[PDB]
Amino acid sequence: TVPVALVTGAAKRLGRSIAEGLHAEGYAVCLHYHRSAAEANALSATLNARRPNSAITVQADLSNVATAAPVTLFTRCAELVAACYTHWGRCDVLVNNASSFYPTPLLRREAMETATADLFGSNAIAPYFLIKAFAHRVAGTPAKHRGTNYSIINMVDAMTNQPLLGYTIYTMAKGALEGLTRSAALELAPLQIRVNGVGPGLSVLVDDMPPAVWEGHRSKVPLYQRDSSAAEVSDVVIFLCSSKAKYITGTCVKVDGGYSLTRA
Amino acid sequence: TVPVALVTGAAKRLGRSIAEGLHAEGYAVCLHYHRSAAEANALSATLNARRPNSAITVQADLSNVATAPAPVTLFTRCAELVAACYTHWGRCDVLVNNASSFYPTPLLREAMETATADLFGSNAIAPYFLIKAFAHRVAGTPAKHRGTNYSIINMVDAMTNQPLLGYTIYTMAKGALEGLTRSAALELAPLQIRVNGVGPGLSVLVHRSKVPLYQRDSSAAEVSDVVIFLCSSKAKYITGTCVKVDGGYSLTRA
Amino acid sequence: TVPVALVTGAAKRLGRSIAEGLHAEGYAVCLHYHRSAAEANALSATLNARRPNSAITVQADLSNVATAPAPVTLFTRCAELVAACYTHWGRCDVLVNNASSFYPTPLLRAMETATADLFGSNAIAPYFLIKAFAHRVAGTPAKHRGTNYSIINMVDAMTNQPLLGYTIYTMAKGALEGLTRSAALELAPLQIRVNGVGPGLSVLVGHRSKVPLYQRDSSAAEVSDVVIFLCSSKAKYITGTCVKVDGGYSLTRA
Amino acid sequence: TVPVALVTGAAKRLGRSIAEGLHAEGYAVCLHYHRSAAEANALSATLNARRPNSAITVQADLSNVATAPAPVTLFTRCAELVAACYTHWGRCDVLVNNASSFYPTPLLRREAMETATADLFGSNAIAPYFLIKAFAHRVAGTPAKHRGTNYSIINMVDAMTNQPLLGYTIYTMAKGALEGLTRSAALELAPLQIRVNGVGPGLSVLVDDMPPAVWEGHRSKVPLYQRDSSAAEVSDVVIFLCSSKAKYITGTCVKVDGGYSLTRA
Numbered sequence A: 001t002v003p004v005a006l007v008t009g010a011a012k013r014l015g016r017s018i019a020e021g022l023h024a025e026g027y028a029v030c031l032h033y034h035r036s037a038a039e040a041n042a043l044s045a046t047l048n049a050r051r052p053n054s055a056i057t058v059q060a061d062l063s064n065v066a067t068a069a070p071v072t073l074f075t076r077c078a079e080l081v082a083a084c085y086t087h088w089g090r091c092d093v094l095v096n097n098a099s100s101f102y103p104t105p106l107l108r109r110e111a112m113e114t115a116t117a118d119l120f121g122s123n124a125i126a127p128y129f130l131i132k133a134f135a136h137r138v139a140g141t142p143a144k145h146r147g148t149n150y151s152i153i154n155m156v157d158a159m160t161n162q163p164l165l166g167y168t169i170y171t172m173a174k175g176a177l178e179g180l181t182r183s184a185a186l187e188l189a190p191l192q193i194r195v196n197g198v199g200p201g202l203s204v205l206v207d208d209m210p211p212a213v214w215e216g217h218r219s220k221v222p223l224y225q226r227d228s229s230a231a232e233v234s235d236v237v238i239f240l241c242s243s244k245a246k247y248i249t250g251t252c253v254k255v256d257g258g259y260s261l262t263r264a
Numbered sequence B: 001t002v003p004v005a006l007v008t009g010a011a012k013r014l015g016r017s018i019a020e021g022l023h024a025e026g027y028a029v030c031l032h033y034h035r036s037a038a039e040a041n042a043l044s045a046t047l048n049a050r051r052p053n054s055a056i057t058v059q060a061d062l063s064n065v066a067t068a069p070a071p072v073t074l075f076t077r078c079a080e081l082v083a084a085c086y087t088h089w090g091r092c093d094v095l096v097n098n099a100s101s102f103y104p105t106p107l108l109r110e111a112m113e114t115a116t117a118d119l120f121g122s123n124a125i126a127p128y129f130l131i132k133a134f135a136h137r138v139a140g141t142p143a144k145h146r147g148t149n150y151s152i153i154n155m156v157d158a159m160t161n162q163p164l165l166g167y168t169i170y171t172m173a174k175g176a177l178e179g180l181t182r183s184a185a186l187e188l189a190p191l192q193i194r195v196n197g198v199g200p201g202l203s204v205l206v207h208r209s210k211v212p213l214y215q216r217d218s219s220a221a222e223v224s225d226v227v228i229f230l231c232s233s234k235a236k237y238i239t240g241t242c243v244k245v246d247g248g249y250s251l252t253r254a
Numbered sequence C: 001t002v003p004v005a006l007v008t009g010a011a012k013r014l015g016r017s018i019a020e021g022l023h024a025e026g027y028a029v030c031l032h033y034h035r036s037a038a039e040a041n042a043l044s045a046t047l048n049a050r051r052p053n054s055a056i057t058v059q060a061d062l063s064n065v066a067t068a069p070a071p072v073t074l075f076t077r078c079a080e081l082v083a084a085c086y087t088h089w090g091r092c093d094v095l096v097n098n099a100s101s102f103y104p105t106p107l108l109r110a111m112e113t114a115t116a117d118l119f120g121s122n123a124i125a126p127y128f129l130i131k132a133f134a135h136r137v138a139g140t141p142a143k144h145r146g147t148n149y150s151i152i153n154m155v156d157a158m159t160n161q162p163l164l165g166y167t168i169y170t171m172a173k174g175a176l177e178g179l180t181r182s183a184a185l186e187l188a189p190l191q192i193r194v195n196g197v198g199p200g201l202s203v204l205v206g207h208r209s210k211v212p213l214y215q216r217d218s219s220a221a222e223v224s225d226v227v228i229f230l231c232s233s234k235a236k237y238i239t240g241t242c243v244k245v246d247g248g249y250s251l252t253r254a
Numbered sequence D: 001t002v003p004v005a006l007v008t009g010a011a012k013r014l015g016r017s018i019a020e021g022l023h024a025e026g027y028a029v030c031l032h033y034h035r036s037a038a039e040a041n042a043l044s045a046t047l048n049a050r051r052p053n054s055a056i057t058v059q060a061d062l063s064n065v066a067t068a069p070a071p072v073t074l075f076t077r078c079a080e081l082v083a084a085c086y087t088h089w090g091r092c093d094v095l096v097n098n099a100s101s102f103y104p105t106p107l108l109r110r111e112a113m114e115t116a117t118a119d120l121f122g123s124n125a126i127a128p129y130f131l132i133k134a135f136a137h138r139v140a141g142t143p144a145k146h147r148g149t150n151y152s153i154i155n156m157v158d159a160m161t162n163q164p165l166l167g168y169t170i171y172t173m174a175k176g177a178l179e180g181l182t183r184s185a186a187l188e189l190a191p192l193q194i195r196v197n198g199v200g201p202g203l204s205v206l207v208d209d210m211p212p213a214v215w216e217g218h219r220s221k222v223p224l225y226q227r228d229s230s231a232a233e234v235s236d237v238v239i240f241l242c243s244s245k246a247k248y249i250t251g252t253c254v255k256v257d258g259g260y261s262l263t264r265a
């Protein structure tokens, strides 16, 4: 009876805020996490206190590596979607929010091979496997039992067309996610599964450098001269998931305060 | 108090849907029309019946020509539209450049100078002047009296990168409008005036089967709700961007 | 047999360099100018001293206004520019829309002049010129047509990251981008290719140090070689595309 | 001073045409191949007979998998391709990322699924990344006074992936990463004067393994000429972007598609 959202990397920051925004609209939310077990369970607790049985947590490394028979990434992704159907009997919304982000400079061991798998798995390959698994489930549901508003959001990046110096794999991974948005929107249109991108510029900018540098980097955003709040992104995601957005598919909405209109 | 929306080409179809959407959020709406006085006045009557003094109508040709009363330029008519809002309600918070002529200007086989003025005016030049007048008024308001949510929406087209055969001047003017959205967003950022695009693909046709999502054109609400969302405070960090509302039509190839 | 190129704003800088490059490939070149009569003529003389009957000059204001004889409209002026190629050499194979005014049209604190000047030269004159060029080609019987028709529109690599205060200009280049796409689709049956070239910083008169490649603006040749390549028979499958020549400048962000 | 070009998937079609067009301009060419040994060796023989010792061949699976010797990583096989150029001719001026696998990965109906991902993503995106890395390291490790004057990297992307081909998601995704690679490497390698550009074909030398009406149906949709392109119609563009006349063009994509991307259903 109640719609279901699967949110990857739901524990903190934009993931938490998306999970909360959907929750506030009456979704039950499956809270995916990798490292951040404590933050995910705290968030689950808060949502379940607000509305009983409105949240669960599931752990998964979305790197394109086999784990713990070794278990593939595809399996782990299928298992994420399956947790939604096991617990609540449905999965209506998928938000591919989880994402690794760190330098892979082109100009100078097993940190190389783990980087590619981590940055590609989380940003691109796992989203592919998630969308596929989400779609198989919809396909397998008799039409009379289908949800009436299936929506998938990929968090891409407003700024990867002006690439961040030294972040090539990340930039390529987000490039791939963009492709996913356009290819899945096309192929899944027959099943009325909408697929769209949301692309933050500077959002909840990590405070881990001198204040002058942090204030320097925010002040470049033309609108407000700051990085966004998490809700300023997440509200956009909740709007794209809503029935008022039911004719939107295959598009990317930039949420960047005009940062992409800038030049050096 | 009550925020105000100026919606051009408000009388019918998407413009009417946008004016209705905005009015449902609590906006007073100034309903611009050109030829559709009957339809624009009936819409005003409906909205004023729902909420007293919540709509007005104003007439202007948005073509890039002079009109008689010294002849009146496009720029002056555009300033007078924005002014009409200020005169009547003391504010103009939202501007929706919706009015648009759309007809063939083929490259292959006099009043081709009519097309230029008409297609280029409504779609690109009048929006530029409207944005300019809009911004002047905000800049002219002492900061402590300014609203908190200035929003300009340009109605562009999802399909203009895959041009409609024979619609060159229309296609060009949409390309001009997209440039207006980016340049205005950047220059108006310091006054907190957001500027975004909404591109319909196929909407309320008066080829439907080619749209990946649903194999139909959209309702007017399917577009105008997106407009309303972009104007709301939840969309306050969005500027300079363009939202396609095309059911995936731009993903297709012949 | 000798093909003909018409180059707008051919007197100096990129226009000159494109005209030279075309000429170097053996084109007869029609050198359009507005105010630079001395430089156009001096260029013509050099190219005529190299090969007789290989260069002419034609004056035209490309602003979207009427001029002195009924008055002469921009359409007539554009058609006559193309007629000059046919009158003198019996053909027009290549059109380069290079002429371009460029100056501030600020949104925040003569408006008619900016509008006519920046839109005409950048967008409407290219439209009329493309239309005249194409009409000629269509009116030539098939057996007598050239085998390599090329239109190049000079656009701007940086207009997605707009220059602050230059709205009408940025809109006009966006209109020209749309002209590239719409004309390439419509003119493909007559095998008229239409492409853009987007210079970034070129032959400046301190943004230069920000260009990732070489930390300088380009030379004129650095751009015009691209234009020559796109007109060559090696580029015969390219149409409706835009080539940035900007040393990676459009890759940057504040 | 004979400049050198590495061309991945050089044995046939567009790769071979690119390897020829570079050879014709005076390049020594290292012709990479995977399963097409015989075609590659044939083309090498042809170009060596025009100009002795101006072609070699190297074999590598560019799939993102470890191979038969410790196992050998994709990263290593990629470094080894750029190495072959230095070992044999002392330089590598031009890299063309052309190798590409292309087949469907439908979202709608499983050692097939693993192998597709590693192959499609390896060939179209991750191999180019490592090739670029290796090519740049060499340039960085060459003392400035000995560096060539015209380094150029071309990635063969696709004019049409913004209008995706139904059922080819991993391919489309890989091409999207490859576009990212162009933009990112152009910016980062700009200080070494290493230009990085994309060339995006539309319908080029279209394989005829459907009924004639299907082939002719496809081709007829191309606005310019109502045909697919020759290999040369793409490779000439590659050659131009590598030439010294293109020395200010970096981080850009050139579509070679006869207007196909302008169309709508």
Ligand SMILES: NC(=O)C1=CN([C@@H]2O[C@H](COP(=O)(O)OP(=O)(O)OC[C@H]3O[C@@H](n4cnc5c(N)ncnc54)[C@H](OP(=O)(O)O)[C@@H]3O)[C@@H](O)[C@H]2O)C=CC1
Pocket (backbone or CB within 6 Å): A008, A009, A010, A011, A012, A013, A014, A015, A032, A033, A034, A035, A036, A037, A060, A061, A062, A063, A096, A097, A098, A099, A100, A101, A118, A121, A122, A155, A156, A157, A158, A199, A200, A201, A202, A203, A204, A205
């Ligand atoms: N903040 C910003 O300005 C920008 C954000 N974005 C994008 O928006 C989205 C949300 O942004 P933000 O909240 O800042 O993202 P974060 O960087 O905070 O990452 C969110 C989560 O992704 C999860 N994650 C990372 N790697 C893996 C992995 N290998 N497997 C599983 N989970 C993983 C982490 O989970 P856990 O903590 O449980 O380990 C982390 O909490 C991301 O996709 C990001 O790329 C894009 C541009 C700018």
Ligand SMILES: NC(=O)C1=CN([C@@H]2O[C@H](COP(=O)(O)OP(=O)(O)OC[C@H]3O[C@@H](n4cnc5c(N)ncnc54)[C@H](OP(=O)(O)O)[C@@H]3O)[C@@H](O)[C@H]2O)C=CC1
Pocket (backbone or CB within 6 Å): B008, B009, B010, B011, B012, B013, B014, B015, B032, B033, B034, B035, B036, B037, B060, B061, B062, B063, B097, B098, B099, B100, B101, B102, B118, B121, B122, B155, B156, B157, B158, B199, B200, B201, B202, B203, B204, B205
């Ligand atoms: N519907 C669709 O499928 C699509 C729509 N769009 C865009 O969406 C917007 C709204 O679409 P739609 O509702 O179909 O538009 P319409 O074609 O119905 O036009 C809306 C109004 O614009 C006004 N108008 C036209 N020319 C002039 C002029 N010279 N001066 C002043 N007003 C003028 C007319 O007002 P009046 O009746 O008062 O004279 C008209 O009712 C437009 O900007 C359009 O470009 C884009 C792509 C597809």
Ligand SMILES: NC(=O)C1=CN([C@@H]2O[C@H](COP(=O)(O)OP(=O)(O)OC[C@H]3O[C@@H](n4cnc5c(N)ncnc54)[C@H](OP(=O)(O)O)[C@@H]3O)[C@@H](O)[C@H]2O)C=CC1
Pocket (backbone or CB within 6 Å): C008, C009, C010, C011, C012, C013, C014, C015, C032, C033, C034, C035, C036, C037, C060, C061, C062, C063, C097, C098, C099, C100, C101, C102, C117, C120, C121, C154, C155, C156, C157, C198, C199, C200, C201, C202, C203, C204
């Ligand atoms: N150089 C650069 O950095 C950049 C250039 N570009 C584009 O590249 C092209 C060439 O650049 P560049 O050589 O610098 O151009 P210029 O600014 O030097 O101008 C070129 C010529 O345009 C002609 N022109 C201007 N206005 C009119 C008018 N109303 N009617 C007729 N002709 C007119 C002038 O002719 P006359 O002198 O005879 O009066 C002028 O010499 C242009 O389209 C430009 O917008 C784009 C981005 C950057």
Ligand SMILES: NC(=O)C1=CN([C@@H]2O[C@H](COP(=O)(O)OP(=O)(O)OC[C@H]3O[C@@H](n4cnc5c(N)ncnc54)[C@H](OP(=O)(O)O)[C@@H]3O)[C@@H](O)[C@H]2O)C=CC1
Pocket (backbone or CB within 6 Å): D008, D009, D010, D011, D012, D013, D014, D015, D032, D033, D034, D035, D036, D037, D060, D061, D062, D063, D097, D098, D099, D100, D101, D102, D119, D122, D123, D156, D157, D158, D159, D200, D201, D202, D203, D204, D205, D206
């Ligand atoms: N032709 C067209 O219409 C289009 C082409 N393109 C792009 O242009 C480029 C060239 O096109 P085209 O000539 O048709 O290419 P092909 O599809 O013929 O493939 C090119 C070569 O790539 C090699 N290859 C494939 N998978 C691998 C792998 N895992 N490892 C190593 N090598 C591999 C093959 O080498 P071998 O034979 O040695 O095994 C093959 O000969 C490609 O990158 C393609 O994606 C893009 C859009 C349309």
Ligand SMILES: O=C1C[C@H](c2cccc(O)c2)Oc2ccc(O)cc21
Pocket (backbone or CB within 6 Å): B100, B101, B102, B159, B164, B201, B202, B203, B205
């Ligand atoms: O009525 C339409 C549909 C029309 C349309 C019709 C058919 C195909 C297509 O891409 C677009 O687009 C319009 C553009 C501007 C406008 O003011 C009205 C319309």
Ligand SMILES: O=C1C[C@H](c2cccc(O)c2)Oc2ccc(O)cc21
Pocket (backbone or CB within 6 Å): C100, C101, C102, C158, C163, C200, C201, C202, C203, C204, C207
């Ligand atoms: O001379 C220039 C440089 C100039 C310029 C200067 C500085 C930044 C930038 O993006 C562009 O751009 C032009 C645009 C049109 C034109 O006719 C000439 C120029």
